[PDB]
Write a protein that binds this ligand. Structure first.
Ligand SMILES: [Mg+2]
Ligand SMILES: [Zn+2]
Lengths: 375, 94, 359, 67, 80, 83, 387
């Protein structure tokens, strides 16, 4: 800021008050606090010309530790710094980008500030999954410039369909599973401690390794002979757990053929059917905003940015939907795939990024029968 | 640390009394994830076929039982419903 | 006279080569400057004087439950060798090959994929790389040559020797799906303007779904692959075949019905109340197509029916149709037999109407 | 050159991309868990402290790590 | 690892046009960004270019799912 | 090479005139390139930073500790006895 | 489940009340008795029918939840946006085609006849005639000023098994609803009949929703610009009151009562000043349409959510309170966060959020919300551990 000039003019104005000038105000000057960051420099950073080291080299930036933080008054965003540009009551030492208060794991979720992870309550190649198909989210955050996204934009319908999606359950479509959605190979090798490579390793069989017994109960295949690698062709199974970027973990409770899934008057049908009762208490409004934005993004064939703390106006997004040709609220006319009758209410359906959590049903199921090893 | 004691086995949550006598590991039991199913009554549970094949129910052959139990015996382990073992009363062997 | 299938419209999805970028890419990647041998076809059909159940059942059959063909690798076809690429696993390639749409007339065709990469760069293997090892020579392609089967890292290879033509129904496996829904509406019922924001949260129809009984429908289905020279003939066969499938299933139910008075595992009819007669029909592996269709005909044939309904529980893999009526067992069967005949005539009329229009 | 050290060292050591990044960027307070005294009001520290903003991510882990 | 042979949601054969679409999209983005024409334009800016008309030219209908899977899907060849 | 240690189950420990964290200046992978890492047998996108031993990968997490040369005046008393 | 693909235990959602379970990855143990004595004991003694009435509280344990509650309300709803809530004979029959019960006789209804949801619910309830009269969760004095209530919906009355009027709601069919219809069915005909009636009513509700589709949209959480102006005016009024108290403190006009220090009295006074006027509900109800708003219907039927939830989503979060107190300064001697001066009088510095979840919180508001959430989670964990 220019407080030294502000103060100096302040003294001069007061002296004129003692005098008969009566124009003391002319000496007073407005206070000014403004960062030296410039729109041009921001462009250079994206172009790669200007780096942080160069920013620190000039007086634009400097590092502040939690100790030195106690000597700093920071404007939470450029909006606040501008709002108090001429305010002498509140002088800021630094200005920060509001996204800085989140890590990559949190920054993955779009429109995070529109949700509270607080109500999202969570407290209390070996074994590695390789998923064939991954796609960039329609509403990407900044985090996806540094991590390769995993998951798929799955058309999700927020509706009550037979009651198989209650209590955080999900109704997947069998065709979506068959086509390769969330499908991959599960790898597990004996490692320390033969058989032909590519051999069906059934339960209770002998696989000599350098470990003959095999009792996993799920057929495997000899991938290699650190040797004796077994690979499983793992698809999406009833009981597998999927979750949206904003928490919202759900278990696949039912799979339906393409003929039984609901469809819109335009032929669009969902991959997932999420129960609307998941939203109210958990308040993942970011999921709804992502769906609304993604509808327009898909229709226009663009990928927009949904990083948290960026300015958001839901009314304008709905108006964008209306311009694109859909309804203002984004709902469509849907038909019951089983009876072919239209729902009396429009159904909110659109893309929503989903990923499968690495906890598989077949891994933890178990059954035993009245005999076996004993202590 | 290397203190194997007769009396050290009794106390604590992992001791004899609390882990062995009060509570026990058991056979003929299954564990799995749960899911919703609107077509199952309140007092019903949907059981996978493979688990129904692993776990068994013991029936004592008798004059009233024989006809109903014959299909299970004939199916064996080839087609569900079937069976896994039979205990002969004369030979006292399974 | 009074064609149930009144108006049809066939509109293939074509590549617009006026666009410079599409034209440049196609001419460079595949030396392609014209429409592909096989193209998707969107068929919009209008039906009049037919129940919604029949039209939706036809749509369901065309989507799946209609026998279709796919390319599958026989066990042991995927040859595991030293040069085999690690990324191009058998599951991935199997999925890709399975879900390629094909239009095959002869099932005794076998294809092989022998691709080797010697260049330093990564090589992409397209569907044109598939070759016909066995079977009668193909006068016309059965699939487009533009699909990306995969890519081989430099110095790697991929050999698959037994790629035969499998048969099935889309319901059991998605690779056998035949039709893609594109439109479904009832021209009988009026509609609100749904841009007004007073009806924005409604379906748009002016009649509640629980009272409306539409009889004039427009149905739109898209078929993935169809030979460009013979679009019209292919649509005839597809539409005709679905009618045949529905007629066959209904005729099996009719066989069960007529075989009453003789022990039948499926049909279980017993008189209750001395005036009513229940009739439960359980058919394994039947779907909503026949259950919904069978409910509608009986309801139309017996307006004063005590009760009729069905339940295709997803975890039972069977269809149970329940019928209760005030009549003797013999009289009830005659009414039900008559109801079945009405569908068969309706779909027989529908089948002939196809030949009149699609031509 | 002594090789017996390697055994103890690797024993001490043992003692997708989002997962890899989160695991490495994680800051484990194990010394404090040892002082938890059987979780005797130990959770009190899992709270968000006013010093965290800008240094320690303030959003919840969401079961991505340990229970 | 590649654009799916068929749309995951419909089964519509978007895989027929996948390679042509990829090449055409690359050319289209290059033409639009020629105003600057570095070696590599920022990804954020690149993805904001509308591809609706480009996709329509190929023949894919105006289906939300098909276009979603066509544009969003990652190509394992580029990332490597 | 790091993959050989992983694939063969051998520890990546260096000669003691000690496990070497991958991506370290002590490891051979230092200053390597994406094309080379693929040729050697590594994933180009992996940032290293974890120890290879016992056939399984191990990564040491950051550990926080009380500051040093600072007087931490803890008012906490002893619960066992108010001594 | 003879389908080889299914590999999970499956139970009716209404059964989760017994086990306190949710389909979020929870696992359960199952063992089949194989000895005659054990089988007899299991079937005659440990049947879940016995656990219908809680031993702890003597009230019901099971009932309709989520989709079943909403569908019961919709089915029994007297008027729909299309018009009167009626269905033809075909759909009335189709409602009962999965209840696994002896279907009722429709021989007296022509195909063109129109039946209301109350009629079909009564048809189902004649198996277990009960008497019941109570106000539903739908009718709330909180909403009465700002919305129109149909006379036939405000009061629920079941007479000898016939639903004379009103809407079945969480108050009537909800899980754990003492005096609900299932409670009376169990008390008069046995716990086993109660479970069967729960299943049948759930099937009716789901079958109805099969046609009267139900959804929640993003536009259901959007305030009309006039409502946004009203909310901003209310927030500004609260801030003005807070600033008046701040001026009082500045001039030293704050006189604490006996027993409270000036600081505690000031904190209590500011906390009371910063509280939503209960008129904040007016702009919310003005913008939303009760007949077709999914979120509002879910909240009002008791199926899920609460009024504070809607207020936070649409109007504004308000004052964050931890241990019934504002954000005590902990960043530094006087500071609460790095973004505020040492001795700040503004309410924004002590945990007042003027934004709404739909509007999007700023960084400090987000930090305060997360502080509150972490507090809640910590309390839950410590409570269970101590118990
Ligand atoms: Mg749970
Ligand atoms: Zn599609």
């Amino acid at each position: 800021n220019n407080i030294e000039k502000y103060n100096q003019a302040c003294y001069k104005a007061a002296e004129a008050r003692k005098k008969g000038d009566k124009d003391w105000e002319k000496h007073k000057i407005p206070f000014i606090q403004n960062t030296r960051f410039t729109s041009q420099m921001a462009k250079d950073i994206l172009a790669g010309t200007l780096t942080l080291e160069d920013l620190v080299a000039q007086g634009i930036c400097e590092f502040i530790t939690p100790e030195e933080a106690e000597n700093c008054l920071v404007a939470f965003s450029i909006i606040e710094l501008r709002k108090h540009k001429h305010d002498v009551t509140r002088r800021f030492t630094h200005v920060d980008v509001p996204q800085a208060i989140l890590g990559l794991a949190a920054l993955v979720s779009p429109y995070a500030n529109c949700t509270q992870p607080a109500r999202v309550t969570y407290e209390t190649d070996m074994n590695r999954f390789f998923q064939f198909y991954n796609e960039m989210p329609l509403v990407k955050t900044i985090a996806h410039n540094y991590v390769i996204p995993n998951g798929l934009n799955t058309i999700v319908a927020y509706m009550i369909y037979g009651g198989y999606n209650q209590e955080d359950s999900v109704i997947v479509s069998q065709s979506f599973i068959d086509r390769g959605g969330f499908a991959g190979t599960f790898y597990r090798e004996e490692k320390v401690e033969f058989v032909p490579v590519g051999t069906v390793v059934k339960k209770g069989d002998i696989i000599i390794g350098k470990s003959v017994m095999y009792g996993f109960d799920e057929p495997a295949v000899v991938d290699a002979v650190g040797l004796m690698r077994l690979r499983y062709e793992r698809n999406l199974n009833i009981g597998d757990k999927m979750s949206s970027r904003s928490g919202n973990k759900g278990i696949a409770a039912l799979a339906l053929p393409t003929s039984d899934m609901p469809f819109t008057e335009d032929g669009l049908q969902p991959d997932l059917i999420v129960n609307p009762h998941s939203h109210p208490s958990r308040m993942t409004n970011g999921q709804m905003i992502e769906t609304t934005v993604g509808l327009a993004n898909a229709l226009q064939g663009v990928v927009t940015d949904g990083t948290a703390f960026l300015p958001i106006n839901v009314q304008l997004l709905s108006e964008r939907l209306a311009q694109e040709g859909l309804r203002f609220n984004g709902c469509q006319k849907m038909f019951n795939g089983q009876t072919g009758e239209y729902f009396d209410a429009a159904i909110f359906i659109g893309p929503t990024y989903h990923q499968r959590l690495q906890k598989f049903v077949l891994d933890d199921r178990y059954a035993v029968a009245s005999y076996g090893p004993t202590d | 640390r290397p203190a194997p004691s007769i009396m050290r086995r009794l106390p604590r949550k992992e001791g004899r009394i609390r882990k062995s006598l009060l509570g026990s590991q058991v056979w003929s039991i299954s564990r799995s994830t749960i899911c919703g199913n609107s077509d199952l009554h309140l007092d019903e549970v949907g059981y996978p076929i493979s688990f129904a094949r692993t776990l068994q129910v013991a029936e004592t052959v008798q004059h009233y039982n024989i006809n109903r139990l014959m299909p299970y015996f004939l199916n064996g382990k080839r087609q569900y419903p079937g069976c896994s073992r039979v205990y002969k009363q004369i030979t006292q062997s399974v | 006279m009074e064609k149930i299938f009144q108006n049809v419209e066939i509109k293939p999805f074509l590549i617009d080569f006026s666009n410079p970028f599409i034209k440049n890419a196609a001419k460079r990647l595949f030396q392609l400057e014209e429409q592909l041998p096989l193209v998707p076809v969107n068929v919009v059909m209008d039906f009049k004087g037919i129940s919604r159940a029949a039209v939706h059942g036809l749509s369901r059959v065309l989507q799946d439950e209609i026998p279709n063909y796919m390319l599958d690798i026989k066990p042991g076809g995927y040859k595991i060798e030293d040069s085999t690429d690690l990324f191009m696993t058998e599951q991935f390639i199997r999925n890709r090959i399975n879900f390629i749409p094909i239009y095959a007339k002869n099932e005794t065709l076998v294809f092989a994929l022998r691709s080797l990469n010697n260049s330093c760069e990564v090589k992409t293997i397209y569907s044109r790389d598939l070759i016909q090892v066995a079977g009668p020579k193909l006068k016309y392609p059965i699939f487009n040559p533009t699909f990306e089967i995969g890519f081989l890292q430099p110095g790697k290879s991929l050999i698959i020797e037994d790629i035969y033509i499998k048969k099935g129904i889309g319901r059991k496996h998605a690779a056998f799906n035949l039709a893609v829904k594109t439109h479904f509406s009832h021209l009988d019922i009026e509609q609100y303007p749904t841009d007004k924001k007073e009806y924005m949260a409604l379906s748009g129809y002016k009649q509640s779904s629980m009272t409306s009984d539409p009889r004039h429908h427009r149905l739109g289905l898209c078929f993935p692959a169809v030979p460009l020279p013979h679009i019209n003939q292919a649509v005839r066969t597809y539409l005709k075949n679905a009618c045949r499938i529905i007629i066959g299933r209904i005729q099996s139910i009719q066989k069960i019905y007529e075989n009453f008075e003789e022990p039948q595992p499926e049909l279980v009819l017993f008189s209750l109340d001395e005036e009513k007669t229940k009739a439960i029909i359980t058919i394994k592996d039947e779907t909503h197509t026949i259950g919904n269709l069978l409910k509608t005909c009986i309801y139309e044939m017996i307006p004063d029916i005590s009760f009729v309904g069905y339940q295709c529980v997803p975890h039972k893999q069977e269809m149970v149709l329940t019928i209760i009526h005030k009549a003797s067992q013999e009289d009830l069967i005659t009414l039900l037999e008559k109801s079945i005949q009405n569908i068969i005539q309706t779909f027989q009329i529908l089948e002939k109407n196809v030949d009149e229009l699609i031509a | 050159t002594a090789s017996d050290l390697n055994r103890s060292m690797e024993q001490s050591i043992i003692s997708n991309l989002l997962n890899t990044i989160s695991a490495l960027r994680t800051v484990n307070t194990h010394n404090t868990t040892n002082a938890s005294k059987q979780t005797e009001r130990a959770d009190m520290m899992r709270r968000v402290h006013a010093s965290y903003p800008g240094y320690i991510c303030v959003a919840q882990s969401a079961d991505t790590g340990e229970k | 690892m590649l654009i799916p042979v068929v749309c995951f949601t419909c089964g519509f054969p978007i895989g027929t046009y996948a390679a042509i679409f990829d090449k055409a999209r690359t050319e289209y983005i290059k033409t639009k960004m020629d105003g600057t024409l570095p070696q590599n334009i920022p990804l954020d800016a690149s993805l904001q270019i509308e591809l609706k008309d480009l996709i329509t030219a190929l023949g894919i209908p105006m289906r939300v799912c098909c276009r979603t899977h066509l544009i969003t899907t990652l190509d394992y060849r580029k990332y490597y | 090479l790091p993959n050989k240690a992983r694939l063969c189950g051998l520890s990546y420990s260096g000669p003691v005139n000690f496990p070497i964290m991958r991506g370290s200046n002590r490891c051979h992978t230092h200053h390597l390139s994406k094309t080379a890492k693929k040729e050697i047998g590594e994933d180009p996108n992996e940032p290293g930073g974890y120890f290879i031993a016992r056939g399984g990968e191990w990564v040491v997490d950051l550990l926080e500790n009380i500051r040093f040369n600072t007087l931490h005046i803890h008012y906490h008393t002893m619960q066992q006895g108010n001594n | 489940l003879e389908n080889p693909k299914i590999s999970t235990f499956q139970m009716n959602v209404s059964a989760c009340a017994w086990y306190n379970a949710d389909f979020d990855g929870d696992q359960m143990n199952l063992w089949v008795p194989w000895s005659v004595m054990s089988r007899v004991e299991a079937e005659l003694l440990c049947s879940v029918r016995n656990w219908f009435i809680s031993t702890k509280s003597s009230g019901p344990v099971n009932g309709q939840v989520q989709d079943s509650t909403v569908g019961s309300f919709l089915l029994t709803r007297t008027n729909t946006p299309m018009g009167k809530n009626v269905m033809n004979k075909l759909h009335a029959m189709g409602l009962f085609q999965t209840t696994q019960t002896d279907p009722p006789c429709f021989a007296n209804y022509s195909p063109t006849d129109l039946l209301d949801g109350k009629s079909v619910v009564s048809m189902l309830l004649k198996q277990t005639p009960i008497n019941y009269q109570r106000a539903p969760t739908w009718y709330s004095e909180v909403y009465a000023p700002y919305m129109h209530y149909n006379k036939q919906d405000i009061s629920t009355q079941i007479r000898n098994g016939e639903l004379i009027e009103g809407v079945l709601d969480k108050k009537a069919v909800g899980a754990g609803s003492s005096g609900g219809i299932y409670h009376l069915i169990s008390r008069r005909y046995g716990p086993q009949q109660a479970l069967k009636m729960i299943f049948a009513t759930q099937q009716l509700a789901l079958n109805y929703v099969r046609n009267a589709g139900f959804t929640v949209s993003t536009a259901d959480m959007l305030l009309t610009p006039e409502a946004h102006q009203e909310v901003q005016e209310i927030i500004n009024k609260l801030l003005l009151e807070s600033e008046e108290i701040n001026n009082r403190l500045l001039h030293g006009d704050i006189m604490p009562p006996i027993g409270l220090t000036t600081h505690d009295f000031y904190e209590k006074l500011q906390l009371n000043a910063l509280k939503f006027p209960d008129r904040i509900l007016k702009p919310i109800m003005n913008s939303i349409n009760p007949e077709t708003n999914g979120l509002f219907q879910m909240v009002a039927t008791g199926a899920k959510g609460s009024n504070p939830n809607m207020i936070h989503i649409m109007a504004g979060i308000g004052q964050i309170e931890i241990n019934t107190q504002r954000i005590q300064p902990q960043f530094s001697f006087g500071r609460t966060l790095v973004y505020y001066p040492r001795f700040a009088l503004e309410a924004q510095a002590y945990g007042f959020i003027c934004n709404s979840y739909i509007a999007g919180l700023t960084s400090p508001e987000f930090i305060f919300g997360e502080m509150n959430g972490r507090f809640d989670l910590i309390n839950k964990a410590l409570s269970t551990s101590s118990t």
